[PDB]
Amino acid sequence: VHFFHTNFLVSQLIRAGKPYQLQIYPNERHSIRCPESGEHYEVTLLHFLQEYL
């Protein structure tokens, strides 16, 4: 699922004037492979739920 998909979504969000949040994992292909990057993914998920859910 190429980065273009997220990129085009963010593009159309920009054009429709809708907010988002975004997180990139610069070194990971499709599964977050490295454990440090996976730990960041999980703490971001817990934080996002904690604050905004």
Q: Does 21 bind a second copy (CB under 8 A)?
A: yes
Q: Does 35 bind a second copy (CB under 8 A)?
A: no
The residue within the footprint of a second copy, chosen from 17, 29, 30, 31 (CB under 8 A), is 17
Name residues whose C-beta falls within 8 Å of residue 45's C-beta, 6 or more positions apart in sequence.
none
We find the least distance from the C-beta atom of residue 18 to a second copy, in angstroms, to be: 8
Q: Does 15 bind a second copy (CB under 8 A)?
A: yes
Which CB sits closer to other proteins, 5 or 22? Answer: 5
**Distances 40 to 3, 8, 21, 52, 53 between C-alpha atoms, Å:** 19, 24, 15, 18, 19
